[PDB]
Design a protein around this nucleic acid. Structure first.
Ligand SMILES: [Mg+2]
Ligand SMILES: [Mg+2]
Ligand SMILES: [Mg+2]
Ligand SMILES: [Mg+2]
Ligand SMILES: [Mg+2]
Ligand SMILES: [Mg+2]
Ligand SMILES: [Mg+2]
Ligand SMILES: [Mg+2]
Ligand SMILES: [Mg+2]
Ligand SMILES: [Mg+2]
Ligand SMILES: [Mg+2]
Ligand SMILES: [Mg+2]
Ligand SMILES: [Mg+2]
Ligand SMILES: [Mg+2]
Ligand SMILES: [Mg+2]
Ligand SMILES: [Mg+2]
Ligand SMILES: [Mg+2]
Ligand SMILES: [Mg+2]
Ligand SMILES: [Mg+2]
Ligand SMILES: [Mg+2]
Ligand SMILES: [Mg+2]
Ligand SMILES: [Mg+2]
Ligand SMILES: [Mg+2]
Ligand SMILES: [Mg+2]
Ligand SMILES: [Mg+2]
Lengths: 258, 197
RNA sequence: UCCAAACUAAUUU
RNA sequence: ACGGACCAGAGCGAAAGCAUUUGCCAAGAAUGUUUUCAUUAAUCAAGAACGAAAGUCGGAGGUUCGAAGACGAUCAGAUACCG
RNA sequence: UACCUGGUUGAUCCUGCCAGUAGCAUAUGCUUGUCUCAAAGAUUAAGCCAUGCAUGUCUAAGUACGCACGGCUACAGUGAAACUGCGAAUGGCUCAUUAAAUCAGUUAUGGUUCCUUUGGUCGCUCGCACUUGGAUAACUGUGGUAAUUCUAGAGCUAAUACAUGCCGACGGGCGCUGACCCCCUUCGCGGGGGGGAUGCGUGCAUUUAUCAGUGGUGACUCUAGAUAACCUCGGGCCGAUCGCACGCCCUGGCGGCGACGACCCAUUCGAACGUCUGCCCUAUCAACUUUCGAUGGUAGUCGCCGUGCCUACCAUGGUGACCACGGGUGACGGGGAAUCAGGGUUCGAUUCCGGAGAGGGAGCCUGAGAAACGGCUACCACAUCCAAGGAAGGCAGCAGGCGCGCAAAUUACCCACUCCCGACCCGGGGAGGUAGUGACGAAAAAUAACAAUACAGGACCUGUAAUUGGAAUGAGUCCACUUUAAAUCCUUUAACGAGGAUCCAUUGGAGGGCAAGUCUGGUGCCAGCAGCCGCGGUAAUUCCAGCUCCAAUAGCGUAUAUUAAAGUUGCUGCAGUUAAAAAGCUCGUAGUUGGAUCUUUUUACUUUGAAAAAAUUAGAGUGUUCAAAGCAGGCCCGCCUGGAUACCGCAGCUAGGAAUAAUGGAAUAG
RNA sequence: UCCGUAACUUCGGGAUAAGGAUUGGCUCUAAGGGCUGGGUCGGUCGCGGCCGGCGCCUAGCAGCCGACUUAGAACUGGUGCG
């Protein structure tokens, strides 16, 4: 191309959006924002293909232009705003206050949280740098920036910020035994405690995570998101608590529910 | 136009490679600035990203550093005496990033005579032979201890011409900054100039 | 240890 | 020029090939070995040495035989067989 | 389904090919009732193109004095046009170019740019404001021209266009300078401790030198700090802008929310250039590259940056039988597709990802992004109007036409769905969607069923009939609903609609391979058939016909590419005494392969973990009426539930294993 | 001067094959040599030496001298230049 792409084909879309291949040729290419394109969830396919509030695309913008949708305490009107992990969608008219967290199969679950849980969120510390006059900064997995963070908060740690304030409330260090969620790869959505952070200089670091059944698995350090301190998750986990059943152990769960 | 691609080169083996696309715009090159000495003439080029880089076609005034006192003044360039890259850039008075230049020394004599009260390169009276109060006159006496410039560098102040060196890239930044040659780097370039004579 | 070459196109098992 | 008989389902040589006597020169297999070295090997594009007979080019020699050639026969023909 | 059959002979066993056989995909032939999906000018000509369309865009929120409309005093409110802004670099089409190139996996940018979006930052600088300047379009008015989305002259008038530019913060602080005062000593000299006027400088960004060693990294010449400065007139920043609601303090003075813009730092979408490994045929291509850069060093120039990218000065290198270089390709690469026991073989123009080009080349403007072609500028080729003066061109966009050919569709309707762009809830989209043409192909499935007789059978059951009987339905016709942007079709339901149920099933065959006749008539080595062996010269099981029969059936022949068959290319798996074939013999470098030995250092190997685009394939779940499909669905105010898993050569990464296979340690002990 | 050279061949030749470019003036720039001295402390008297403590040019400097030639570049002329 001579410049940046603007469309997105239907079959070339991300798998976890769960679009179908006979509705149209294209998929909603999400706008540029705080989340990556393969790691986001656009607002139109959340309101239309999950919640059934609208039936077409034009009925989504009739919701959004009436300013009924809030993201992170702020009104967003774009139908392809990239919403992502640990984000809070506040509809607030029906009073629902969603929080996007992956299920155990690796797609965004329609997950409801309590309307005082929607005051805050969690963020992974991606970068620490100082600025002019020696002022430290902090960059999250979202594109937001915090001036004057806590001196103990280092890279890959998880902070808890307040929406509508934008300041740091509390943080969790990346340590052994803390409670984390996997945000990428073949273990997308699984939850367990950190067993061992295996270091490799130059290349990627690998973290072994032990599930709450005895199962263990490993993932790169760039996909590990700490969600709890010790064994206590600081959010409300979805239905299943991040346990990946085998394909036999989810057959009988269907078979013992008929 | 002027392309700075790689695909017009032959391969490592010596095989001629065949082009697979027309020459793209991010592979452009532009003509050299060939910055001379004279009254200031600077052109700006719109470059990739919408940015601007300043290319200077004539420059007479620079910003050079004395180095061993952290004394940087804005002085005037007289001429070019040496160029390691091409001998015929000296004859046409072209200023490039490492060429050895020759500058007026009077901002460096004037600062030195004010910081040490000692004549430099002399065979008005107020800054040198001033009546100082004895607390102030005390302060100039520990500066008097370390006031000795090397013998190769006191020669330069008598002719009023320091031998200097460009450090910036004129024709990219539009300026000519650099530092004064001193020490073993001075006497290396001194005998190269004497050998060409 | 004398010589001694050739053989319907006219077809049906 | 040629080395009969002896001369063989015998020998030697990488193969082509190799036979009178004696001398000289260098080689080599097999056997023998309680010597020595200690894997130095096997097969091999490119490359290399050898390679009957006929043929080629120089010298020498030319007895026998003998392509080509010339005749005598035979033959329907016989520029072939035989002389 | 890991399959063979005919053909050399008088007969036999062989080697061996030819011929069958089965898909697949292109053309074609004959035929064709229904209905659901669906390819479709790639192959030859990346040949040439008439006409039309395919890209524009306005909110309460940049600029309305167009009465073009319009309500009751700077400006109501709509608002054409015009300026300004933004997009037009995406999409779409085609496969010519291109053989470590493109591309794929893998990594890097600690070697770079990045409009927008989102989050920071935006009184950090000591130095007319209650608003500054000029211009221009729309409009009006005079025109020119054969001509065009040509434009001239004159009068107006705007800004978030274009310029210019201040107050406030703002009290100073901090560095340097140092007049000067002051205190404690001192025989004195000297020495010691504060205050300090007046001057110079001061923030980010930029550029260079130097000093010190807040946070980070495997690793910085990183980030931050300190100092000396500089800061381009073709000029970095530091708001002369707009709308909502409008309150509050004592004319004044403050205040809520937005929009728009900003240098810079992140972020997002990327982009570009690098790392490692991987490609078809060819030796009747064996050496190639290099003072016209080939390989490297030093310094620069250029560039967004690393770099022989380029220049100067040097060095003489670099690549190659492990196939360089050269040539070819009926070569865009890949995901993939057809065939298939296991291995393979062939294909991939073609809807997804990546690349390329817009008649051929070349050069550029604008912009964040282009060497752009529904942008300019040339020249070549071609071609269009012309009053001969000139002007305009680019369908490998959708349609359409010509040409080329064995070979490929309507100059249809629509922004309703999918999404994209814009100032935008309103506009636009030949992207896309829907119809038409559609035996490319794929799924489903009519052309009769029954009963009684007449008869035949079988050990009460069954068959045969130009006999008979009323039962059942679609095809078709056809109202209406539904469907949808409006339709159409399907689905639904009235009305009709079957006896030769004339509402008629073809395509190939009948010696053998190979399912099916020694029937009848004609022809007489003729006409003809026949893939192969063959047939025909007067009783043709083979031709031409009739009768019968067979095969598969709304499909079936035929041509050609190709796969299996083919263990007839042989890795699995072939041969080489006489059938095709082992070089005359030996040496010999590459290459290939290498004896035994030990517990009973680097790799290869093996196992595992990551990270690996979907679609396709395998496969889970689910009654599209079934099936091909599809990702749906299911249960009585709503509730419940799916949208799995596997596989993804090699290379690179990770942790276990230590047999096998390489390799390494102490012999002048260095 | 710099490039570039076929058929044919007794492999020597053909060959100055053929074919093309360049050439002035001026101002510079590189490159190509030769002769001398590398003597550290008077250890210390027959401003010079007599025998040796005293030292590291050793990747060569420094002085003087000297021909001719090749290459490159800028400028310059009514495109002229063997
Ligand atoms: Mg004898
Ligand atoms: Mg050989
Ligand atoms: Mg012979
Ligand atoms: Mg002779
Ligand atoms: Mg005779
Ligand atoms: Mg026979
Ligand atoms: Mg065959
Ligand atoms: Mg495109
Ligand atoms: Mg990026
Ligand atoms: Mg070709
Ligand atoms: Mg292009
Ligand atoms: Mg064309
Ligand atoms: Mg172009
Ligand atoms: Mg076009
Ligand atoms: Mg067709
Ligand atoms: Mg079919
Ligand atoms: Mg019919
Ligand atoms: Mg047959
Ligand atoms: Mg085959
Ligand atoms: Mg087979
Ligand atoms: Mg065979
Ligand atoms: Mg044979
Ligand atoms: Mg032999
Ligand atoms: Mg062994
Ligand atoms: Mg001649």
């Amino acid at each position: 191309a001579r410049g940046p792409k603007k469309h997105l084909k239907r079959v070339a879309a991300p798998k976890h959006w769960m679009l179908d291949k006979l509705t149209g040729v294209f998929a909603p290419r999400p706008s540029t924002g705080p989340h990556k394109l393969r790691e986001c969830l656009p607002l139109i396919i959340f309101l239309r293909n999950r919640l059934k509030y609208a039936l077409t695309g034009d009925e989504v913008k009739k919701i959004c232009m009436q300013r009924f949708i809030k993201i992170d305490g702020k009104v967003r009107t774009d139908i392809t705003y990239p919403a992502g992990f640990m984000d809070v969608i506040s509809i607030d008219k029906t009073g629902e206050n969603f929080r996007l967290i992956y299920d155990t199969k690796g797609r965004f679950a329609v997950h409801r949280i309590t309307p005082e849980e929607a005051k805050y969120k969690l963020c992974k510390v991606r970068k620490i740098f100082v600025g002019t006059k020696g002022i430290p900064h902090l960059v999250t997995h979202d594109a937001r920036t915090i001036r004057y963070p806590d001196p103990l908060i280092k890279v890959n740690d998880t902070i808890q910020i307040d929406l509508e304030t934008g300041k740091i409330t509390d943080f969790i260090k990346f340590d052994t035994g803390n409670l984390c969620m996997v945000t990428g790869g073949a273990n997308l959505g699984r939850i367990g405690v950190i067993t061992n952070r295996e270091r490799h200089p130059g290349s990627f670091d690998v973290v072994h995570v032990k599930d709450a059944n005895g199962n263990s698995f490993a993932t790169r350090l760039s996909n590990i998101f700490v969600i709890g301190k010790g064994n206590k998750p600081w959010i409300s986990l979805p239905r299943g608590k991040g346990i990946r059943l085998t394909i036999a152990e989810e057959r009988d769960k269907r078979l013992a529910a008929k | 136009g002027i392309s700075r691609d790689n695909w017009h080169k032959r391969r490592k083996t010596g095989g001629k490679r065949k082009p697979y696309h027309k020459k793209r715009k991010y592979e452009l090159g532009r003509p050299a600035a060939n910055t001379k000495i004279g009254p200031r003439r600077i052109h700006t080029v719109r470059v990739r990203g919408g940015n601007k880089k300043y290319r200077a076609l004539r420059l007479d005034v620079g910003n050079f550093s004395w180095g061993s006192e952290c004394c940087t003044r804005k002085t005037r360039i007289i001429d070019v005496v040496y160029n390691a890259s091409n001998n015929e850039l000296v004859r046409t008075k072209t200023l490039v990033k490492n060429c050895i230049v020759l500058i007026d020394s009077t901002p460096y004599r004037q600062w030195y005579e004010s910081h040490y009260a000692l004549p430099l390169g002399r065979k008005e009276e107020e800054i040198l032979n001033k009546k100082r109060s004895k607390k102030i006159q005390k302060k100039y006496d520990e500066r008097k201890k370390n006031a000795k410039i090397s013998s190769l560098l006191e020669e330069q102040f008598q002719q009023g011409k320091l031998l200097a060196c460009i450090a910036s890239r004129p024709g990219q930044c539009g300026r000519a900054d650099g530092y004064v040659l001193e020490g073993k780097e001075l006497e290396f370039y001194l005998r190269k100039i004497k050998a060409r004579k």
